[PDB]
Amino acid sequence: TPEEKLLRAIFGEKASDVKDSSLRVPNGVSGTVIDVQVFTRDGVEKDKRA
Amino acid sequence: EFLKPRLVDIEQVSSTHAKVTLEPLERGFGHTLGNALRRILLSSMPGCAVTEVEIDGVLHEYSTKEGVQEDILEILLNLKGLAVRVQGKDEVILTLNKSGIGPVTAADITHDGDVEIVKPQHVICHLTDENASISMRIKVQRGRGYVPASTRIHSEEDERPIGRLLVDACYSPVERIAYNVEAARVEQRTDLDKLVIEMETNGTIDPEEAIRRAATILAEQLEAFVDLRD
Amino acid sequence: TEFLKPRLVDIEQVSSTHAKVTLEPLERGFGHTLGNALRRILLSSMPGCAVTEVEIDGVLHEYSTKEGVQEDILEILLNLKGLAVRVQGKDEVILTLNKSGIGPVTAADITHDGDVEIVKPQHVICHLTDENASISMRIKVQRGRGYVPASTRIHSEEDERPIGRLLVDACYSPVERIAYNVEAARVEQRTDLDKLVIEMETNGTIDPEEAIRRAATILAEQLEAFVD
Amino acid sequence: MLNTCYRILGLKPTVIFADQIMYTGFAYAARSGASVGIDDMVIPEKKHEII
Amino acid sequence: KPLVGTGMERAVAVDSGVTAVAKRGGVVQYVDASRIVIKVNEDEMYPGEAGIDIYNLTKYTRSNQNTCINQMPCVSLGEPVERGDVLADGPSTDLGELAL
Amino acid sequence: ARVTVQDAVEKIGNRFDLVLVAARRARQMQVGGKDLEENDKTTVIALREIEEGLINNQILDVRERQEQQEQEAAEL
């Protein structure tokens, strides 16, 4: 919008080129993490953790 | 012109049992002091108990070291009933190393100068291999009542490591307190009682020290009624 | 180790024989251990003075009926049992009442001695009808501790009583009714704190706030040989 | 006892009296310890001859 | 356990699948938090190249209702185990019985 | 504080207009047209005025038509 653009030039912040959609623990539940599974489609390179 | 209850002989039935007596109790006061104290002893006696264990190669409580025949969630439930005394310090960090087949008891903890383990045959875990090994660094603190591990997670202060297993702490040396007010006969009086406070601790708190530590909790709380300040 | 003492102790005065103290915030569970040891001291062991026996010169039995008075003999004793009398020095003093006229016999019509001091002049003792101007008796006040019914001493009475020595229930303590009530309160992060709310009357002779004070002294002195 | 207290005094004393009747019934019911054992339910002596 | 049962608990905890019941008699050789090793007797052992039985337990896993289901060993070293015995408790079981 | 509006229903004897007389008045405190308070909200203050006799459906109208005579002054 227009006001959001004036708020940019005053502070010159870079545009965000990607939206954050992380996985987050549900509300009000807390406890250790006892495992992790990582499946990879055949044809993409595994990250350092998988 | 009331009489004053005076602490008298202390029968000691076992290392954990005990009985006291308060000889010249006036009429009607056997139950006023008897239950006023028993609600003080079961609530507010200071003791020490484990507060967080840290084993050498295990990450979380739901793991299982190889060589012992118990989960890491079951070693913590055996440590939580570890009766221990700390003489001068506030918090200590005990240590336990052992290898070879056979049970691991509290007698195998590295004997520090102040920390005096009281029940030295308390079993902790069994090692069922000739080349197994456990190494844990327990911790001990002082407090009163019962503070779960969830509460202390708010006062963790950036608990950096992820190998720090936390156990719930129940610092209280007494487990049951009865009493019986029976008839006492002084050399010349018509109405007089005799209180018999039969307390049973877990070998940590001294009996005589445990009743003076109560009256200074009660007589200190009645300072408010002695002067009403509006 | 390091406990929690009460601040913001409010006291509300209404009908000066009455009074309702509040208090907070006490530790968890210190509401009952405190207010209940106080209620046991006000009711059972608290020094005071009250009448114990009377000598109606014209009546010789608790069930009989005296001339001129509109009332009975029993309902007479109900009046004296509630007479609030505070004596200064002695422990036994035998007052005498002798009234004439037509109407109700108030309390100030008794003789007054050198240290005895009644605390209600308009207390009615008996309504006296006309033509008589006649009533007489001996009221016997003495000091003691707690409350002592007239049933237990008569069961074991060694102080011999001639025919016509009525035995009136002796209530020594100055508190008439006392009952606390514990409730929840917080200290801005702890939901489990207590708030003792005492509430006490008295039979005139001593203000309520002076009874709660001199009761905690009786209980704070028993622990004189334990605290340090 | 509550139906008469409403007709005679209105709603202010009947709301402040339906509580105090509850704090007195709860309190003096605990002093009973009205616990139901197995000696309570009594079989009549003549349940066998009547059958 | 229940202090007041009906004797139909040893059959509802064994005839289910949670317990790890022995398959041949013998003698326990190595109990551990996640494994048991029974060394069978001779008369129960087959003639040619039989060896031993070895039971793996299933430590903390996930059920359908998200509760946890893991087995704990209830034997020691040297304890002779017989055919039809019970070696590993399940979830809601204790010494073979069914404690809920 | 309030537990029963039985006093307010005495003055306004309907209970369907006491909810309409008090919502109109309680707006005025909420939007600071006016300030007649023991740490109360604006809907328990409007009921402690009706309970005391200083507000009803006529005292709100006539105090509004005395606003126009005020607004007529500054209207010039």
Next chain:
Amino acid sequence: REEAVVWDILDEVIREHPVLLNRAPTLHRLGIQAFEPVLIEGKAIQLHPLV
């Protein structure tokens, strides 16, 4: 984050604000009543016994 002040503002927003409790199969008109809340700790809605 539930700082120490929001509990001071949440205790002040709930001053005289009545909430409407209502059970599942509302048969008659007394299945929906209002109550002045008082903040407790836990996860269960308390409820007066007479109600």
Next chain:
Amino acid sequence: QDVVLGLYYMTRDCVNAKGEGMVLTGPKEAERLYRSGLASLHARVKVRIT
């Protein structure tokens, strides 16, 4: 259901309890007599009520 079993137990009468046949001086004297441990909660007394 339960506050009515408390009212019932309190306002019954035995035939011979502690403190039987005595005479009291009002409800403030009975509650101060039962809580003191002298008279039973339902013993036949005679009081004065206004």
Next chain:
Amino acid sequence: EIKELLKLGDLPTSGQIRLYDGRTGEQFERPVTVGYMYMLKLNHLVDDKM
């Protein structure tokens, strides 16, 4: 046959003990029952209802 066991543990045959109150310290009149009920814990947890 339940009564033959309570004479083995030296208990009151009637099955009812005389409890004391916890706070006041006084004794419950008319003795009470005390036993051992095997209690389950249904999984209608309130953490999933709220």
